[PDB]
């Protein structure tokens, strides 16, 4: 789970493997990562559950050119 | 695992990398349900993971090391 840095910091880091396959089908290369959070508690927000913000972030997979050569 | 000695703090243990292994087929039940084939270990890759109830801060962190298993 997200655990956070120091006890006095306020920064969670976590260790994710890219999966090559969610759910009965593989990841594609190029495909478009999004990876969205609720905060529930936004700089808007009173209190705790007042507003919904959400944020996300654009993450990206390796694209190279699966060149396919002979020897003659 | 076995100490290193009385009070070193230091486990040490080993086996010997067998040339063919059975793949589990899923971890989603106990007991585990192993494939009906097995397959030679060689070029995959040995992974060990040490779970540790209490890291420096004094929580669970999930640590381990990575190897292959070569071939000639």
Do not use: H, M
Not at chain 1, 32 to 37: Q, T
Not at chain 2, 42 to 64: C, H, K, M, P, Q
């Amino acid at each position: 789970d997200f655990r956070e840095t120091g006890d006095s910091t306020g920064i969670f880091q976590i260790v994710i493997e890219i999966p090559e396959s969610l759910s009965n089908d593989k990841l594609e290369r190029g495909e478009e990562i999004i990876l969205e959070y609720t905060d529930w508690g936004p700089s808007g927000s009173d209190y705790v559950g007042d507003e919904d913000e959400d944020v996300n972030l654009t993450i990206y997979t390796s694209n190279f050119g699966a060149t396919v050569e002979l020897d003659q | 695992l076995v100490e290193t000695g009385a009070a070193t703090g230091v486990f040490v243990g080993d086996f010997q990398i067998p040339s063919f292994w059975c793949r589990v087929s899923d971890t989603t039940t106990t007991p585990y349900t192993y494939a009906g084939d097995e397959e030679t270990t060689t070029g995959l890759d040995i992974e060990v993971n040490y779970v540790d109830f209490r890291d420096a801060s004094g929580e669970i962190v999930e640590v381990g090391d990575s190897a292959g298993v070569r071939a000639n």
